[PDB]
Write a protein that binds this ligand. Structure first.
Ligand SMILES: [Zn+2]
Lengths: 122, 53
């Protein structure tokens, strides 16, 4: 079934290959303030309370759709700041807490996040 | 001797209430923050230096 996990992987890869993915918090900050965002997702595994609270306030300001991933390293692997190392499993994964989609890039299966938007709207 | 750049743990310019100003320029603004020194204000990427007494 086309769930939000596989569709999220798809849209994040598509954003990456078209250079429309701003990884981090400083880049997420300036991108969110510039009103050039399309989607934001933060990781549950953040011990810092100010980070999560700031992301909630900033996302709430422009009311963009929100997703969770529940693992800092998994989200880092998804966004693509890693080295493949001749296999599907990669090594030396860098945690990425927040990432904002500057551009979808290619309109392939982009509807699924909007489907999830209606699911939250419900 | 060479300069060794100092590291900061996180960025805290917010509380939505911003705690610094933003560079009034064509190229940059609304997201780039102007340094608030003890006397002056200064934008890093552009060098606009609003002195204030
Ligand atoms: Zn500037």
């Amino acid at each position: 079934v086309m769930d939000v996990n596989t569709a999220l992987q798809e849209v994040l890869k598509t954003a990456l290959i078209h250079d429309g993915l701003a990884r981090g918090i400083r880049e997420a900050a300036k991108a969110l303030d510039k009103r050039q965002a399309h989607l934001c997702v933060l990781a549950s595994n953040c011990d810092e309370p100010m980070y999560v609270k700031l992301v909630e306030a900033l996302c709430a300001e422009h009311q963009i759709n929100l997703i969770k991933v529940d693992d800092n390293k998994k989200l880092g692997e998804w966004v693509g700041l890693c080295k493949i190392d001749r296999e599907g499993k990669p090594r030396k994964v860098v945690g990425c807490s927040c990432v904002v989609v500057k551009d979808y890039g290619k309109e392939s299966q982009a509807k699924d996040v909007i489907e999830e938007y209606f699911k939250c709207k419900k | 001797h060479k300069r060794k750049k100092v590291k900061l743990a996180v960025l805290k310019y917010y509380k939505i209430s911003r705690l610094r100003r933003e560079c009034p320029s064509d190229e940059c603004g609304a997201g780039v923050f102007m340094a608030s020194h003890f006397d002056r204000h200064y934008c890093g990427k552009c060098c606009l230096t609003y002195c204030f007494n």
